[PDB]
Amino acid sequence: MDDKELIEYFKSQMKEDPDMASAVAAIRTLLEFLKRDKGETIQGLRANLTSAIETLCGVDSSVAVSSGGELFLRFISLASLEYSDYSKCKKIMIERGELFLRRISLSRNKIADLCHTFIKDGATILTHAYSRVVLRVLEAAVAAKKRFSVYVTESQPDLSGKKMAKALCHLNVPVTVVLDAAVGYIMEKADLVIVGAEGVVENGGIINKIGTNQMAVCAKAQNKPFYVVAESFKFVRLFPLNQQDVPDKFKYKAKEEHPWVDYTAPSLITLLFTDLGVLTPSAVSDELIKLYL
Amino acid sequence: YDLLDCHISICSPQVAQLFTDNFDYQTRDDFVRGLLVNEEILGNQIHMHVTAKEYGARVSNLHMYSAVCADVIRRWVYPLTPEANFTDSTTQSCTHSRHNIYRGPEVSLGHGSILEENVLLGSGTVIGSNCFITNSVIGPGCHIGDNVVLDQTYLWQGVRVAAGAQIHQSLLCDNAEVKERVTLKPRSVLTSQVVVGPNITLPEGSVISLHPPDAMK
């Protein structure tokens, strides 16, 4: 099928269910594209898949999409070169893709189960922007008879924090909203910091919504732990050194341009909660190599 | 004059004989006094050993009962704390926290409640909102309302307390009940199944029991 069908299917899948990330939609679109092929040679199919991934990347500019596409491409073909009939190989790869899609969807519950035991009783928690996995973690924590208070940030320019505040108020939890310029003023009362992630880099740092770097520095100045929640399919191969090493195709969405993302160094992070387990920033270098088979 | 009695002694078989020859002896004090008075012959001397770095006590009335309970809570007798669970019972387990706070299993807590220090909660207890409990022991399976103040009190199993109450230094037995707008002054005792009505204020030293008032009204 052509690119117009690809874009239409992608947008329809995104719009049908709001509780879904871009990566899952991209993976489902790629699987549907795989099921609608007619070729006879493997590398022609490889070229078609690469072109499809490249076209899909141009619509939405997020880090997770490209990494998910690459992981899907190199995970689908562990053993598909044995027989001489195209049909058997195609069936085997379709089965492998279905298995991969099945295995993708169990990460959030594992993350919540591993992370909910780090919250004390009667504690104040700071957070930035909106993230669904953090909400799941908090739901699991409140299901275990614990009490805490939450501070959130308005997170300009789209006021994303108020949405998370409204979602939190539905679970009768004390939640308050502060300004974007009062983070350092309010760090005094906090006890721990939990944020989401948009991509994990080779040296252990992260890429996230603009405004995380200053919060991390302020928390480091007063010796507060910094926790990160992420997923396996968000691992990318990149080794930035400063703020200007980030590729420009991720900074500006499709100074005065207001870049949307920023990078945080591994020396300001305490622990990482992934579906692979609990890893210090030093083990990410090995785990990324092992993952990229 | 700086010795505390533990009521623990090491006795020889001969002691038994001395309790059959003298038909009038009835306690240990009588035996000690008789031995210390008659210094003629046989089985005369008595010795004492004094310790300094261990613990030992006996319970004989309410005052010493309260003192011993307070000493036990604060880990003064420790090979044995509430966390140890030396009884090997499945219904008596707890977790230790800061400021000497012990929490049993499944116990639920409301919003705004504050526990100061030296508190024990049994399994199944339910607590409302905006309470204040200090230096108290609560048995298993008790229901407590809202805006309740407990200070140096002791509650046993299956006791229900209504909202808006103030209690100080009192003991409650099994299956007691207290209605609303009740204030118990220090040193109050309630026996089994005793119920106290609302809008009352008992004076100090009150004792209430379901048995005949002084041994059908």
mmCIF file with all atom_site columns, N, CA, C and O in Angstrom, chain A residues 249-292:
data_model
loop_
_atom_site.group_PDB
_atom_site.id
_atom_site.type_symbol
_atom_site.label_atom_id
_atom_site.label_alt_id
_atom_site.label_comp_id
_atom_site.label_asym_id
_atom_site.label_entity_id
_atom_site.label_seq_id
_atom_site.pdbx_PDB_ins_code
_atom_site.Cartn_x
_atom_site.Cartn_y
_atom_site.Cartn_z
_atom_site.occupancy
_atom_site.B_iso_or_equiv
_atom_site.pdbx_formal_charge
_atom_site.auth_seq_id
_atom_site.auth_comp_id
_atom_site.auth_asym_id
_atom_site.auth_atom_id
_atom_site.pdbx_PDB_model_num
ATOM 1   N N  . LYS A 1 249 ? 16.845 18.172 14.343 1.00 0.00 ? 249 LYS A N  1
ATOM 2   C CA . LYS A 1 249 ? 15.534 17.646 13.986 1.00 0.00 ? 249 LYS A CA 1
ATOM 3   C C  . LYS A 1 249 ? 14.706 17.259 15.202 1.00 0.00 ? 249 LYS A C  1
ATOM 4   O O  . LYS A 1 249 ? 13.516 16.968 15.050 1.00 0.00 ? 249 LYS A O  1
ATOM 5   N N  . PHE A 1 250 ? 15.300 17.238 16.395 1.00 0.00 ? 250 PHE A N  1
ATOM 6   C CA . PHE A 1 250 ? 14.554 17.011 17.625 1.00 0.00 ? 250 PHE A CA 1
ATOM 7   C C  . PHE A 1 250 ? 14.316 18.284 18.421 1.00 0.00 ? 250 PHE A C  1
ATOM 8   O O  . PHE A 1 250 ? 13.333 18.361 19.164 1.00 0.00 ? 250 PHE A O  1
ATOM 9   N N  . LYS A 1 251 ? 15.194 19.279 18.289 1.00 0.00 ? 251 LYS A N  1
ATOM 10  C CA . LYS A 1 251 ? 15.046 20.520 19.043 1.00 0.00 ? 251 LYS A CA 1
ATOM 11  C C  . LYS A 1 251 ? 13.765 21.248 18.661 1.00 0.00 ? 251 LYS A C  1
ATOM 12  O O  . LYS A 1 251 ? 12.861 21.426 19.486 1.00 0.00 ? 251 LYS A O  1
ATOM 13  N N  . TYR A 1 252 ? 13.667 21.674 17.407 1.00 0.00 ? 252 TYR A N  1
ATOM 14  C CA . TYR A 1 252 ? 12.563 22.507 16.960 1.00 0.00 ? 252 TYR A CA 1
ATOM 15  C C  . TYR A 1 252 ? 11.470 21.642 16.347 1.00 0.00 ? 252 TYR A C  1
ATOM 16  O O  . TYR A 1 252 ? 11.735 20.843 15.443 1.00 0.00 ? 252 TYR A O  1
ATOM 17  N N  . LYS A 1 253 ? 10.248 21.803 16.843 1.00 0.00 ? 253 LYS A N  1
ATOM 18  C CA . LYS A 1 253 ? 9.128  21.025 16.341 1.00 0.00 ? 253 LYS A CA 1
ATOM 19  C C  . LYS A 1 253 ? 8.747  21.474 14.935 1.00 0.00 ? 253 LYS A C  1
ATOM 20  O O  . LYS A 1 253 ? 8.938  22.631 14.553 1.00 0.00 ? 253 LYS A O  1
ATOM 21  N N  . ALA A 1 254 ? 8.205  20.539 14.162 1.00 0.00 ? 254 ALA A N  1
ATOM 22  C CA . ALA A 1 254 ? 7.801  20.817 12.790 1.00 0.00 ? 254 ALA A CA 1
ATOM 23  C C  . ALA A 1 254 ? 6.600  21.754 12.750 1.00 0.00 ? 254 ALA A C  1
ATOM 24  O O  . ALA A 1 254 ? 6.737  22.942 12.457 1.00 0.00 ? 254 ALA A O  1
ATOM 25  N N  . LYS A 1 255 ? 16.397 29.939 20.485 1.00 0.00 ? 255 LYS A N  1
ATOM 26  C CA . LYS A 1 255 ? 15.990 30.825 21.569 1.00 0.00 ? 255 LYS A CA 1
ATOM 27  C C  . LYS A 1 255 ? 14.533 31.235 21.407 1.00 0.00 ? 255 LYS A C  1
ATOM 28  O O  . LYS A 1 255 ? 13.651 30.698 22.075 1.00 0.00 ? 255 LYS A O  1
ATOM 29  N N  . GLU A 1 256 ? 14.286 32.193 20.511 1.00 0.00 ? 256 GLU A N  1
ATOM 30  C CA . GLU A 1 256 ? 12.915 32.587 20.214 1.00 0.00 ? 256 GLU A CA 1
ATOM 31  C C  . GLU A 1 256 ? 12.124 31.448 19.590 1.00 0.00 ? 256 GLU A C  1
ATOM 32  O O  . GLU A 1 256 ? 10.888 31.465 19.636 1.00 0.00 ? 256 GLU A O  1
ATOM 33  N N  . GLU A 1 257 ? 12.805 30.460 19.010 1.00 0.00 ? 257 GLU A N  1
ATOM 34  C CA . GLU A 1 257 ? 12.142 29.274 18.487 1.00 0.00 ? 257 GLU A CA 1
ATOM 35  C C  . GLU A 1 257 ? 11.668 28.329 19.583 1.00 0.00 ? 257 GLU A C  1
ATOM 36  O O  . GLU A 1 257 ? 10.874 27.428 19.293 1.00 0.00 ? 257 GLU A O  1
ATOM 37  N N  . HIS A 1 258 ? 12.134 28.513 20.820 1.00 0.00 ? 258 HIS A N  1
ATOM 38  C CA . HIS A 1 258 ? 11.657 27.753 21.967 1.00 0.00 ? 258 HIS A CA 1
ATOM 39  C C  . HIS A 1 258 ? 11.868 26.257 21.765 1.00 0.00 ? 258 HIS A C  1
ATOM 40  O O  . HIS A 1 258 ? 10.907 25.532 21.479 1.00 0.00 ? 258 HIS A O  1
ATOM 41  N N  . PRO A 1 259 ? 13.101 25.768 21.876 1.00 0.00 ? 259 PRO A N  1
ATOM 42  C CA . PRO A 1 259 ? 13.341 24.330 21.713 1.00 0.00 ? 259 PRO A CA 1
ATOM 43  C C  . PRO A 1 259 ? 12.527 23.521 22.711 1.00 0.00 ? 259 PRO A C  1
ATOM 44  O O  . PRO A 1 259 ? 12.316 23.938 23.851 1.00 0.00 ? 259 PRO A O  1
ATOM 45  N N  . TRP A 1 260 ? 12.063 22.356 22.268 1.00 0.00 ? 260 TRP A N  1
ATOM 46  C CA . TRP A 1 260 ? 11.124 21.568 23.051 1.00 0.00 ? 260 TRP A CA 1
ATOM 47  C C  . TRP A 1 260 ? 11.790 20.570 23.984 1.00 0.00 ? 260 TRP A C  1
ATOM 48  O O  . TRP A 1 260 ? 11.158 20.144 24.955 1.00 0.00 ? 260 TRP A O  1
ATOM 49  N N  . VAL A 1 261 ? 13.040 20.190 23.729 1.00 0.00 ? 261 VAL A N  1
ATOM 50  C CA . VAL A 1 261 ? 13.693 19.145 24.502 1.00 0.00 ? 261 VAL A CA 1
ATOM 51  C C  . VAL A 1 261 ? 15.054 19.629 24.981 1.00 0.00 ? 261 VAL A C  1
ATOM 52  O O  . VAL A 1 261 ? 15.638 20.568 24.438 1.00 0.00 ? 261 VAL A O  1
ATOM 53  N N  . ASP A 1 262 ? 15.551 18.962 26.018 1.00 0.00 ? 262 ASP A N  1
ATOM 54  C CA . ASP A 1 262 ? 16.869 19.250 26.561 1.00 0.00 ? 262 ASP A CA 1
ATOM 55  C C  . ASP A 1 262 ? 17.459 17.982 27.168 1.00 0.00 ? 262 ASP A C  1
ATOM 56  O O  . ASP A 1 262 ? 16.751 17.006 27.436 1.00 0.00 ? 262 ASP A O  1
ATOM 57  N N  . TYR A 1 263 ? 18.771 18.014 27.379 1.00 0.00 ? 263 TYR A N  1
ATOM 58  C CA . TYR A 1 263 ? 19.550 16.841 27.745 1.00 0.00 ? 263 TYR A CA 1
ATOM 59  C C  . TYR A 1 263 ? 20.107 16.985 29.155 1.00 0.00 ? 263 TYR A C  1
ATOM 60  O O  . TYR A 1 263 ? 20.601 18.051 29.533 1.00 0.00 ? 263 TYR A O  1
ATOM 61  N N  . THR A 1 264 ? 20.024 15.904 29.926 1.00 0.00 ? 264 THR A N  1
ATOM 62  C CA . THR A 1 264 ? 20.504 15.860 31.300 1.00 0.00 ? 264 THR A CA 1
ATOM 63  C C  . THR A 1 264 ? 21.610 14.820 31.418 1.00 0.00 ? 264 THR A C  1
ATOM 64  O O  . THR A 1 264 ? 21.443 13.676 30.976 1.00 0.00 ? 264 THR A O  1
ATOM 65  N N  . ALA A 1 265 ? 22.722 15.226 32.030 1.00 0.00 ? 265 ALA A N  1
ATOM 66  C CA . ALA A 1 265 ? 23.937 14.440 32.146 1.00 0.00 ? 265 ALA A CA 1
ATOM 67  C C  . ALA A 1 265 ? 23.774 13.300 33.148 1.00 0.00 ? 265 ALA A C  1
ATOM 68  O O  . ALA A 1 265 ? 22.932 13.362 34.044 1.00 0.00 ? 265 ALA A O  1
ATOM 69  N N  . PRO A 1 266 ? 24.580 12.240 33.018 1.00 0.00 ? 266 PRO A N  1
ATOM 70  C CA . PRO A 1 266 ? 24.441 11.094 33.929 1.00 0.00 ? 266 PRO A CA 1
ATOM 71  C C  . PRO A 1 266 ? 24.928 11.354 35.341 1.00 0.00 ? 266 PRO A C  1
ATOM 72  O O  . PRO A 1 266 ? 24.644 10.540 36.228 1.00 0.00 ? 266 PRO A O  1
ATOM 73  N N  . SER A 1 267 ? 25.652 12.442 35.587 1.00 0.00 ? 267 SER A N  1
ATOM 74  C CA . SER A 1 267 ? 26.184 12.703 36.918 1.00 0.00 ? 267 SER A CA 1
ATOM 75  C C  . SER A 1 267 ? 25.169 13.358 37.842 1.00 0.00 ? 267 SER A C  1
ATOM 76  O O  . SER A 1 267 ? 25.488 13.602 39.009 1.00 0.00 ? 267 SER A O  1
ATOM 77  N N  . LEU A 1 268 ? 23.966 13.655 37.353 1.00 0.00 ? 268 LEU A N  1
ATOM 78  C CA . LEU A 1 268 ? 22.919 14.272 38.154 1.00 0.00 ? 268 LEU A CA 1
ATOM 79  C C  . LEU A 1 268 ? 21.739 13.335 38.380 1.00 0.00 ? 268 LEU A C  1
ATOM 80  O O  . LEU A 1 268 ? 20.657 13.792 38.758 1.00 0.00 ? 268 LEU A O  1
ATOM 81  N N  . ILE A 1 269 ? 21.922 12.038 38.156 1.00 0.00 ? 269 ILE A N  1
ATOM 82  C CA . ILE A 1 269 ? 20.845 11.059 38.207 1.00 0.00 ? 269 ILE A CA 1
ATOM 83  C C  . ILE A 1 269 ? 21.224 9.963  39.191 1.00 0.00 ? 269 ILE A C  1
ATOM 84  O O  . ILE A 1 269 ? 22.374 9.512  39.216 1.00 0.00 ? 269 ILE A O  1
ATOM 85  N N  . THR A 1 270 ? 20.258 9.536  40.002 1.00 0.00 ? 270 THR A N  1
ATOM 86  C CA . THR A 1 270 ? 20.517 8.534  41.031 1.00 0.00 ? 270 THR A CA 1
ATOM 87  C C  . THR A 1 270 ? 20.234 7.115  40.540 1.00 0.00 ? 270 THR A C  1
ATOM 88  O O  . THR A 1 270 ? 21.123 6.260  40.562 1.00 0.00 ? 270 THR A O  1
ATOM 89  N N  . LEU A 1 271 ? 19.004 6.850  40.104 1.00 0.00 ? 271 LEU A N  1
ATOM 90  C CA . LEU A 1 271 ? 18.602 5.507  39.713 1.00 0.00 ? 271 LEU A CA 1
ATOM 91  C C  . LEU A 1 271 ? 17.671 5.578  38.511 1.00 0.00 ? 271 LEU A C  1
ATOM 92  O O  . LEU A 1 271 ? 17.023 6.595  38.262 1.00 0.00 ? 271 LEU A O  1
ATOM 93  N N  . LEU A 1 272 ? 17.609 4.475  37.770 1.00 0.00 ? 272 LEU A N  1
ATOM 94  C CA . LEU A 1 272 ? 16.757 4.364  36.593 1.00 0.00 ? 272 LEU A CA 1
ATOM 95  C C  . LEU A 1 272 ? 15.874 3.135  36.731 1.00 0.00 ? 272 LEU A C  1
ATOM 96  O O  . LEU A 1 272 ? 16.368 2.048  37.040 1.00 0.00 ? 272 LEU A O  1
ATOM 97  N N  . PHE A 1 273 ? 14.578 3.305  36.496 1.00 0.00 ? 273 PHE A N  1
ATOM 98  C CA . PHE A 1 273 ? 13.601 2.226  36.609 1.00 0.00 ? 273 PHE A CA 1
ATOM 99  C C  . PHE A 1 273 ? 13.120 1.867  35.209 1.00 0.00 ? 273 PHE A C  1
ATOM 100 O O  . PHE A 1 273 ? 12.262 2.551  34.644 1.00 0.00 ? 273 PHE A O  1
ATOM 101 N N  . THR A 1 274 ? 13.670 0.794  34.656 1.00 0.00 ? 274 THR A N  1
ATOM 102 C CA . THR A 1 274 ? 13.266 0.283  33.356 1.00 0.00 ? 274 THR A CA 1
ATOM 103 C C  . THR A 1 274 ? 12.655 -1.102 33.514 1.00 0.00 ? 274 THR A C  1
ATOM 104 O O  . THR A 1 274 ? 12.705 -1.713 34.583 1.00 0.00 ? 274 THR A O  1
ATOM 105 N N  . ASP A 1 275 ? 12.071 -1.598 32.423 1.00 0.00 ? 275 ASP A N  1
ATOM 106 C CA . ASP A 1 275 ? 11.489 -2.933 32.446 1.00 0.00 ? 275 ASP A CA 1
ATOM 107 C C  . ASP A 1 275 ? 12.548 -4.023 32.502 1.00 0.00 ? 275 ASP A C  1
ATOM 108 O O  . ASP A 1 275 ? 12.213 -5.182 32.761 1.00 0.00 ? 275 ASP A O  1
ATOM 109 N N  . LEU A 1 276 ? 13.813 -3.681 32.258 1.00 0.00 ? 276 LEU A N  1
ATOM 110 C CA . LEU A 1 276 ? 14.894 -4.645 32.402 1.00 0.00 ? 276 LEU A CA 1
ATOM 111 C C  . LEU A 1 276 ? 15.335 -4.814 33.849 1.00 0.00 ? 276 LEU A C  1
ATOM 112 O O  . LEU A 1 276 ? 16.051 -5.773 34.156 1.00 0.00 ? 276 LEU A O  1
ATOM 113 N N  . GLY A 1 277 ? 14.929 -3.920 34.729 1.00 0.00 ? 277 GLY A N  1
ATOM 114 C CA . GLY A 1 277 ? 15.300 -3.973 36.128 1.00 0.00 ? 277 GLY A CA 1
ATOM 115 C C  . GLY A 1 277 ? 15.610 -2.576 36.639 1.00 0.00 ? 277 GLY A C  1
ATOM 116 O O  . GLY A 1 277 ? 15.117 -1.587 36.102 1.00 0.00 ? 277 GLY A O  1
ATOM 117 N N  . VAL A 1 278 ? 16.430 -2.523 37.683 1.00 0.00 ? 278 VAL A N  1
ATOM 118 C CA . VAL A 1 278 ? 16.906 -1.271 38.257 1.00 0.00 ? 278 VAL A CA 1
ATOM 119 C C  . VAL A 1 278 ? 18.392 -1.163 37.949 1.00 0.00 ? 278 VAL A C  1
ATOM 120 O O  . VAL A 1 278 ? 19.180 -2.023 38.358 1.00 0.00 ? 278 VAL A O  1
ATOM 121 N N  . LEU A 1 279 ? 18.774 -0.116 37.226 1.00 0.00 ? 279 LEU A N  1
ATOM 122 C CA . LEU A 1 279 ? 20.139 0.039  36.751 1.00 0.00 ? 279 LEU A CA 1
ATOM 123 C C  . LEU A 1 279 ? 20.691 1.396  37.153 1.00 0.00 ? 279 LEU A C  1
ATOM 124 O O  . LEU A 1 279 ? 20.002 2.413  37.044 1.00 0.00 ? 279 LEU A O  1
ATOM 125 N N  . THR A 1 280 ? 21.937 1.404  37.615 1.00 0.00 ? 280 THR A N  1
ATOM 126 C CA . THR A 1 280 ? 22.669 2.646  37.754 1.00 0.00 ? 280 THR A CA 1
ATOM 127 C C  . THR A 1 280 ? 23.073 3.145  36.371 1.00 0.00 ? 280 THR A C  1
ATOM 128 O O  . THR A 1 280 ? 23.091 2.376  35.408 1.00 0.00 ? 280 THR A O  1
ATOM 129 N N  . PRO A 1 281 ? 23.396 4.434  36.239 1.00 0.00 ? 281 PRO A N  1
ATOM 130 C CA . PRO A 1 281 ? 23.763 4.959  34.914 1.00 0.00 ? 281 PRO A CA 1
ATOM 131 C C  . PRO A 1 281 ? 24.972 4.280  34.295 1.00 0.00 ? 281 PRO A C  1
ATOM 132 O O  . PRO A 1 281 ? 25.162 4.383  33.077 1.00 0.00 ? 281 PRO A O  1
ATOM 133 N N  . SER A 1 282 ? 25.796 3.593  35.086 1.00 0.00 ? 282 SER A N  1
ATOM 134 C CA . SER A 1 282 ? 26.966 2.917  34.542 1.00 0.00 ? 282 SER A CA 1
ATOM 135 C C  . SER A 1 282 ? 26.622 1.646  33.779 1.00 0.00 ? 282 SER A C  1
ATOM 136 O O  . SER A 1 282 ? 27.386 1.252  32.892 1.00 0.00 ? 282 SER A O  1
ATOM 137 N N  . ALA A 1 283 ? 25.507 0.991  34.098 1.00 0.00 ? 283 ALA A N  1
ATOM 138 C CA . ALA A 1 283 ? 25.135 -0.253 33.438 1.00 0.00 ? 283 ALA A CA 1
ATOM 139 C C  . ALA A 1 283 ? 24.394 -0.040 32.125 1.00 0.00 ? 283 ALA A C  1
ATOM 140 O O  . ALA A 1 283 ? 24.229 -1.000 31.357 1.00 0.00 ? 283 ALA A O  1
ATOM 141 N N  . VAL A 1 284 ? 23.957 1.189  31.847 1.00 0.00 ? 284 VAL A N  1
ATOM 142 C CA . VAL A 1 284 ? 23.226 1.464  30.617 1.00 0.00 ? 284 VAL A CA 1
ATOM 143 C C  . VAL A 1 284 ? 24.107 1.221  29.403 1.00 0.00 ? 284 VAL A C  1
ATOM 144 O O  . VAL A 1 284 ? 23.626 0.762  28.361 1.00 0.00 ? 284 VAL A O  1
ATOM 145 N N  . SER A 1 285 ? 25.405 1.512  29.512 1.00 0.00 ? 285 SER A N  1
ATOM 146 C CA . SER A 1 285 ? 26.303 1.314  28.377 1.00 0.00 ? 285 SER A CA 1
ATOM 147 C C  . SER A 1 285 ? 26.351 -0.149 27.959 1.00 0.00 ? 285 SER A C  1
ATOM 148 O O  . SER A 1 285 ? 26.363 -0.460 26.762 1.00 0.00 ? 285 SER A O  1
ATOM 149 N N  . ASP A 1 286 ? 26.385 -1.062 28.930 1.00 0.00 ? 286 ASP A N  1
ATOM 150 C CA . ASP A 1 286 ? 26.393 -2.484 28.605 1.00 0.00 ? 286 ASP A CA 1
ATOM 151 C C  . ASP A 1 286 ? 25.018 -2.923 28.112 1.00 0.00 ? 286 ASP A C  1
ATOM 152 O O  . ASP A 1 286 ? 24.912 -3.663 27.123 1.00 0.00 ? 286 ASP A O  1
ATOM 153 N N  . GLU A 1 287 ? 23.955 -2.470 28.782 1.00 0.00 ? 287 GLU A N  1
ATOM 154 C CA . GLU A 1 287 ? 22.619 -2.947 28.436 1.00 0.00 ? 287 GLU A CA 1
ATOM 155 C C  . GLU A 1 287 ? 22.203 -2.498 27.042 1.00 0.00 ? 287 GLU A C  1
ATOM 156 O O  . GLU A 1 287 ? 21.511 -3.234 26.331 1.00 0.00 ? 287 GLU A O  1
ATOM 157 N N  . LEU A 1 288 ? 22.600 -1.293 26.635 1.00 0.00 ? 288 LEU A N  1
ATOM 158 C CA . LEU A 1 288 ? 22.279 -0.825 25.293 1.00 0.00 ? 288 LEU A CA 1
ATOM 159 C C  . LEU A 1 288 ? 22.968 -1.677 24.236 1.00 0.00 ? 288 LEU A C  1
ATOM 160 O O  . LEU A 1 288 ? 22.365 -2.008 23.209 1.00 0.00 ? 288 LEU A O  1
ATOM 161 N N  . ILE A 1 289 ? 24.230 -2.038 24.470 1.00 0.00 ? 289 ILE A N  1
ATOM 162 C CA . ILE A 1 289 ? 24.941 -2.898 23.531 1.00 0.00 ? 289 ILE A CA 1
ATOM 163 C C  . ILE A 1 289 ? 24.268 -4.259 23.446 1.00 0.00 ? 289 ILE A C  1
ATOM 164 O O  . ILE A 1 289 ? 24.089 -4.813 22.355 1.00 0.00 ? 289 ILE A O  1
ATOM 165 N N  . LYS A 1 290 ? 23.877 -4.817 24.592 1.00 0.00 ? 290 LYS A N  1
ATOM 166 C CA . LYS A 1 290 ? 23.236 -6.129 24.578 1.00 0.00 ? 290 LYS A CA 1
ATOM 167 C C  . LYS A 1 290 ? 21.875 -6.081 23.890 1.00 0.00 ? 290 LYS A C  1
ATOM 168 O O  . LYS A 1 290 ? 21.495 -7.026 23.190 1.00 0.00 ? 290 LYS A O  1
ATOM 169 N N  . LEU A 1 291 ? 21.127 -4.991 24.082 1.00 0.00 ? 291 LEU A N  1
ATOM 170 C CA . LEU A 1 291 ? 19.791 -4.887 23.502 1.00 0.00 ? 291 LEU A CA 1
ATOM 171 C C  . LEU A 1 291 ? 19.853 -4.816 21.981 1.00 0.00 ? 291 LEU A C  1
ATOM 172 O O  . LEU A 1 291 ? 19.095 -5.502 21.288 1.00 0.00 ? 291 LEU A O  1
ATOM 173 N N  . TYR A 1 292 ? 20.748 -3.986 21.445 1.00 0.00 ? 292 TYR A N  1
ATOM 174 C CA . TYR A 1 292 ? 20.883 -3.824 19.999 1.00 0.00 ? 292 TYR A CA 1
ATOM 175 C C  . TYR A 1 292 ? 21.591 -5.059 19.454 1.00 0.00 ? 292 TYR A C  1
ATOM 176 O O  . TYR A 1 292 ? 22.811 -5.097 19.275 1.00 0.00 ? 292 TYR A O  1
#
